[PDB]
C-alpha cells in the first residue's frame, strides 16, 4: 500500500457539529472505498495567506491514510471534496 | 567490445613506450605470452613476468630504454587483423627494416620470428611487425 | 512488483537459488512484456515507455536464441511453459 | 464507431454508417411500444404544412420517461437499444419495484448501472436531480423548463449543457447552442451527456437512404416558376435578383431573425447564440 496524507480546508463559518459530521462523512468515504484511515486530526485554524473562495480564514484538517494504489479511495475523496462546498481546498500527497 | 586482444596488447606497449612508462600490465593469454617472450629474447623489452589471478592471469612488461632514455621499440604494427587475416607462404615471409626489425609469425611450429620461420622454411600468420 | 518477480523466479529456477539463468530471465522478461503491453494499449502515445518494451523484447529474443543454440531441449521446454513461438 | 463501406457501387461510394456496437439488443419492450403514424407534414386540415416530409420506414413509438420523477427506488440499466424516433439511443431500465421504463442513454452508460433520481442521488451519469442540487460546472442533459413537465432540452445525440451558477430561484445554464439562460431551480436534469456522439459524422451516401429516413426531395426556389416562388422564373440560371433571398413566402432567408421580439423568456435569457 501507499501512504497518503490529505490536508483539506473546511470553511470557517461551518458549525462545530456540522464540521464533525463533514469529517465523519469523508472518513467514511475513504474507508468504504477501501482505504484505511490511520489518523485524522483538526490540525489548526489559520488565516489564509491569500483569499480562497472569498475566505481569508479556514480550518485545516489532516487525514493520514494508507490504501492500495489501484484502489479508488483517493480519487473518490477528491471527487466528492471537489463537489462539496464545505471544503475550500484539499491536497493529497504521498508520504514515504 | 574488444575484438583483437593482440592488437590491444601491441597498442598498450606502444602507448606506454610513447610516454616512456617503465612498465605496463595486460590480461594474460597464450598468444600474448608468446609475443612477450619473443620481445624479451629479441631485446626489445627489458623483462616479462606473469601474475596468476582468478580471471585469466596478468602479464607485466618492463619496457627497455637505452642510454639517454632512448626508446628501444620504434613502433609496433598489427598486420593480421580479424577483419582481414594475413597469411604468408614460406617464401613470402617479409623483412622488417631489412632485418633491423622483426615480424612475429604464428606457424604450425609455434609463434616465431621471421628469421626463424625462413630458417625452417615454413609460412604462417603474420601477427605483427616490430622495430 | 518484487513479490510477483520472486514467485516467477522460484517457479522457473533451474535449481535452488538460481536467480540468473536463461529460463528465469526469459520468464521474468515475458511477464514484464505482457504487463507492459497492456500499459501500451492503454497509453498508445507513451512512445518513451514503448522504447523500453522493445528493448526488453530484443533482450528476451537474444536469450531465446542463446538458449536454443546451447540446449535445444531446454529451449523447447521453456517455450512450451511460457506459451511462446 | 463509424464504418465506411467500400465503394462497390456508385451509390455505396463514400457512404458511412454506425456499427451499432453499443446497441445490446434489437427487441424493444412490448409494454412501452406505442403506435405512430407518419403525418408526412400534413395537419388536421390535410394541407402540407411542412414541406419535404413523408414516406420512409414504418416506426413504433417508444415511451421515454423524460420526467425521471420516480425517486423511491433504483433503476438498473438492462439494455441499450436503437430508437427510430430520435438520434440518441435509449436505455431500458428496470426499477426494483418491477416498473419498466425507457430513458435516454447518456454517454458512457453501461448495462448494470443502478441509476437513482431525487435530491439525494449522487452526481453520477444517468442520475436525475433538481437543478438546485447539481453542483456548478456539471454537465447535464434532458433539462425540463417547467417543474414536473419532463425533460425538454438537451436530448439530441451527443448534446450536453453545463451548469454555470445559481441566482434567486433560477439556475444559470449554458445550453448546447451556446446560449446562456436562467432555468427554474426546481427543474430536473440528468447528469452526463447524451450518448451516440458519433451520430453527426454519418454520411448518408445516397438519395434512397434519405427517403428511408422520411425526407422528401427539396426543390430549390430558383428553379420554380414566378407564381411558385419569389425566386422562380427568369431565362436560364438566374441569380437571386432580389434585395435578399427569401423563403417561398417571402421571409428573408439569410440573417433575418425570427424570434418574437416581445418574448416573455427574454427576461430569463442571459446571453443569446444562434
Amino acid at each position: 500500500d501507499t501512504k497518503y496524507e490529505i490536508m483539506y480546508i473546511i470553511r470557517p463559518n461551518i458549525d462545530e457539529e456540522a464540521k464533525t459530521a463533514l469529517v465523519e462523512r469523508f472518513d467514511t468515504i475513504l474507508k468504504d472505498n477501501g482505504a484505511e484511515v490511520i489518523e485524522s486530526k483538526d490540525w489548526e485554524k489559520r488565516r489564509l495567506a491569500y483569499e480562497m473562495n472569498g475566505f481569508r480564514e479556514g480550518i485545516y484538517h489532516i487525514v493520514n491514510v494508507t490504501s492500495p494504489s489501484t484502489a479508488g479511495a483517493i480519487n473518490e475523496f477528491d471527487r466528492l471534496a471537489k463537489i462539496n462546498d464545505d471544503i475550500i481546498r484539499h491536497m493529497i500527497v504521498k508520504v514515504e | 567490445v574488444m575484438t583483437d586482444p593482440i592488437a590491444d596488447f601491441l597498442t598498450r606497449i606502444r602507448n606506454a613506450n610513447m610516454v616512456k612508462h617503465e612498465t605496463l600490465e595486460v590480461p594474460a593469454s597464450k598468444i600474448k605470452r608468446d609475443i612477450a617472450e619473443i620481445l624479451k629474447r629479441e631485446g626489445f623489452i627489458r623483462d616479462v613476468e606473469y601474475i596468476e589471478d582468478d580471471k585469466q592471469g596478468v602479464i607485466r612488461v618492463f619496457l627497455k630504454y637505452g642510454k639517454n632514455e632512448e626508446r628501444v621499440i620504434t613502433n609496433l604494427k598489427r598486420i593480421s587483423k580479424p577483419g582481414l587475416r594475413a597469411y604468408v607462404k614460406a617464401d613470402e615471409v617479409p623483412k622488417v627494416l631489412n632485418g633491423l626489425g622483426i615480424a612475429i609469425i604464428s606457424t604450425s611450429e609455434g609463434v616465431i620470428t621471421d628469421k626463424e620461420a625462413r630458417a625452417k622454411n615454413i609460412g604462417g600468420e603474420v601477427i605483427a611487425y616490430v622495430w | 512488483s518484487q513479490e510477483r518477480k520472486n514467485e516467477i523466479i522460484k517457479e522457473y529456477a533451474r535449481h535452488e537459488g538460481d536467480t540468473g539463468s536463461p529460463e528465469v530471465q526469459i520468464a521474468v522478461l515475458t511477464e514484464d512484456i505482457n504487463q507492459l503491453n497492456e500499459h501500451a494499449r492503454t497509453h498508445k502515445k507513451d512512445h518513451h515507455s514503448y522504447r523500453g518494451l522493445m528493448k526488453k523484447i530484443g533482450h528476451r529474443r537474444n536469450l531465446l536464441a542463446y538458449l536454443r543454440k546451447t540446449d535445444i531441449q531446454r529451449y523447447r521446454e521453456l517455450i512450451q511453459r511460457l506459451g511462446l513461438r | 464507431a463509424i464504418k465506411k463501406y467500400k465503394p462497390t457501387t456508385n451509390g455505396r461510394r463514400n457512404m458511412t454508417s454506425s456499427d451499432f456496437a453499443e446497441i445490446t439488443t434489437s427487441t424493444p419492450e412490448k409494454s412501452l411500444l406505442q403506435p405512430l403514424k407518419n403525418n408526412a407534414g400534413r395537419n388536421n386540415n390535410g394541407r402540407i404544412t411542412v414541406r419535404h416530409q413523408g414516406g420512409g420506414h414504418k416506426r413504433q413509438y417508444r415511451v421515454i420517461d423524460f420526467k425521471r420523477n420516480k425517486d423511491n427506488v433504483a433503476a438498473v440499466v438492462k439494455t441499450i437499444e436503437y430508437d427510430p424516433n430520435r438520434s440518441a439511443n435509449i436505455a431500458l431500465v428496470h426499477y426494483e419495484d418491477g416498473v419498466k421504463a425507457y430513458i435516454l442513454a447518456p454517454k458512457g452508460l453501461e448495462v448494470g448501472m443502478r441509476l437513482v433520481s431525487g435530491p439525494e442521488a449522487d452526481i453520477k451519469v444517468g442520475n436525475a436531480l433538481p437543478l438546485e442540487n447539481i453542483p456548478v460546472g456539471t454537465v447535464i442533459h434532458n433539462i425540463e423548463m417547467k417543474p414536473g413537465k419532463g425533460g425538454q432540452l438537451i436530448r439530441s445525440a451527443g448534446t450536453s449543457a453545463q451548469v454555470l451558477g445559481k441566482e434567486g430561484k433560477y439556475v444559470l445554464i449554458r445550453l448546447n447552442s451556446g446560449e446562456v439562460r436562467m432555468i427554474l431551480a426546481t427543474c430536473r436534469a440528468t447528469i452526463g451527456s447524451v450518448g451516440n456522439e458519433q451520430h453527426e459524422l454519418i454520411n448518408i451516401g445516397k438519395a434512397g437512404r434519405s427517403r428511408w429516413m422520411r425526407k422528401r426531395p427539396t426543390v430549390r426556389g430558383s428553379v420554380m416558376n414566378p407564381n411558385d416562388h419569389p425566386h422562380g422564373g427568369g431565362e436560364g440560371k438566374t441569380p437571386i435578383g432580389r434585395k435578399a433571398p427569401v423563403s417561398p413566402w417571402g421571409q428573408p432567408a439569410i440573417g433575418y431573425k425570427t424570434r418574437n421580439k416581445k418574448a416573455k423568456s427574454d427576461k430569463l435569457i442571459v446571453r443569446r447564440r444562434t
Binding site: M7, I9, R46, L48, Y50, R89 | - | - | -
Partner: protein, 63 residues
C-alpha cells in the same frame, strides 16, 4: 551553511511554514541556493514544499 543539513532533517513537510519562511524573501519569492548556502538536493525539496504551501494557502504567492 546548509541549514537543512545542519538541523539534520531529511523530510521537508510543507506544513512547517516556520521552516519554509526562512527560505523565501520579502514579496514571497524563493531564495537562490547560492544565497542561502544550501545544496542542490535540499533546494529542490524546499522548492516543492514551498509551492505546495502556496497552493494550500499556508504561504503567499506574492507580497
Amino acid at each position: 551553511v546548509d541549514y537543512i543539513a545542519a538541523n539534520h532533517i531529511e523530510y521537508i513537510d510543507y506544513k512547517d511554514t516556520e521552516l519554509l519562511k526562512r527560505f523565501i524573501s520579502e514579496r514571497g519569492k524563493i531564495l537562490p541556493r547560492r544565497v542561502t548556502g544550501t545544496g542542490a538536493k535540499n533546494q529542490r525539496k524546499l522548492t516543492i514544499a514551498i509551492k505546495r504551501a502556496r497552493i494550500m494557502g499556508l504561504l503567499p504567492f506574492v507580497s
